[PDB]
Every structure is written in C-alpha cells, then in structure tokens.
Amino acid sequence: EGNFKGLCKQIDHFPEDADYEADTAEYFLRAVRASSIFPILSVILLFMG
Amino acid sequence: MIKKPQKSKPGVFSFLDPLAYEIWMCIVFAYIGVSVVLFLVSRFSPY
Amino acid sequence: DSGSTKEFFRRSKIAVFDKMWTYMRSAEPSVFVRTTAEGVARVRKSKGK
Ligand SMILES: N[C@@H](CCC(=O)O)C(=O)O
Incomplete structure (x- = not known):
C-alpha cells in the first residue's frame, strides 16, 4: 500500500x-x-525429532 | 548543559523492588531454620 | 569564544579547573565555539560526547 508495493x-x-x-x-x-x-532452533529439534 | 537522558526502564529483576537486598537475605536464613526445627520436633523418637 | 568563563578558567586557580583549563587549552579540535546555538546543536549531534 504505497508508491512501490512489495519492496522488502x-x-x-x-x-x-x-x-x-x-x-x-x-x-x-x-x-x-x-x-x-530460538525459532530456528524450534525447527531443529522438530526436525531432529 | 548536556543532552537529555531517556526513560531507561526497569530490568529483569524489577519484581523485587518492594524489599531491600538485605531483607531477602534474612528471609532465606529464616527459611532454613524453621524447617530444621520442625525436623527436630518431628522425628525425635516419640516412643 | 570571547567569554568571561573562557577567561575564568584561564585565571581559575582551582586545580580541577586548572586541569580542565589544561585540557581546554589542549582540546584538539576546538571545543570552543563562537556563538550560542553553535555549541548547543553541537552537543545535540555529539550523541553525549
Ligand atoms: N555574560 C558573560 C557571558 C560569557 C561567559 O560567561 O563567559 C560575558 O559577557 O562575558
């Protein structure tokens, strides 16, 4: 919602x-x-599990 | 004249604001001795 | 600059004020400013320095 939308x-x-x-x-x-x-590590043990 | 300070907030252990550090220290010392007095009276061989 | 205070520490005999004046004569570059708000916004952009 601007003059250029989706510029990250x-x-x-x-x-x-x-x-x-x-x-x-x-x-x-x-x-x-x-x-x-921690959110990357929340993937890790979930992947390791 | 120097710059303004900011409103630097309280920290992690802000919760123990109502008591002095030395007050807390007295509590734990009280905490132990009450138990062992109860450990004296209970388990005293009430034969 | 051309302030009586700038002249005061030149003439101030208190040792810390001497020591400040010892620094202020040796402050490189100029801590001294010519006009009023010159020093003000200098502090405002000094970021506490
Ligand atoms: N009123 C002072 C201002 C500068 C200072 O305090 O050094 C004067 O005219 O000298």
Whole structure:
C-alpha cells in the first residue's frame, strides 16, 4: 500500500544516541533479537525429532 | 548543559523492588531454620 | 569564544579547573565555539560526547 508495493527491506539494530552499552541486558537482548535463534532452533529439534 | 537522558526502564529483576537486598537475605536464613526445627520436633523418637 | 568563563578558567586557580583549563587549552579540535546555538546543536549531534 504505497508508491512501490512489495519492496522488502532487510532490517537490523541501529545505533541511536549513546546506544546504552551499559544496558548490556538490553544489548544482549538486541543481540538475541536480530536472529531467528530460538525459532530456528524450534525447527531443529522438530526436525531432529 | 548536556543532552537529555531517556526513560531507561526497569530490568529483569524489577519484581523485587518492594524489599531491600538485605531483607531477602534474612528471609532465606529464616527459611532454613524453621524447617530444621520442625525436623527436630518431628522425628525425635516419640516412643 | 570571547567569554568571561573562557577567561575564568584561564585565571581559575582551582586545580580541577586548572586541569580542565589544561585540557581546554589542549582540546584538539576546538571545543570552543563562537556563538550560542553553535555549541548547543553541537552537543545535540555529539550523541553525549
Ligand atoms: N555574560 C558573560 C557571558 C560569557 C561567559 O560567561 O563567559 C560575558 O559577557 O562575558
């Protein structure tokens, strides 16, 4: 629903102001996020099963 | 003058906000001793 | 630039303020700015630096 429909962007985490690196609980949460790590692993044991 | 901070939210262990860290520590110490007192009275050979 | 505060730390005898002025004379490039909002949006794009 736009001037170009079906243009699929690749998206990751982006560095905003000061990045809150001291929030290592957040940065790790960012690190888990941009990944299919558990939904890919949800395939794995289901495939292995 | 420096930049604004953001509204950096509470974390994972936010739930234990109502108590001091030292209060929780007293609870566990209390938790053990109550059991072993019951382990004293129960199983004491009530012959 | 051409501020009394910029002259104050030149004349300030407090050791931390000296040490700031020791840095501020050695701050490369210019931390010093000519006009007001010049320094403001500089901080606003500094991302806390
Ligand atoms: N009112 C001050 C502003 C600059 C400063 O504080 O250094 C002046 O005219 O010198």
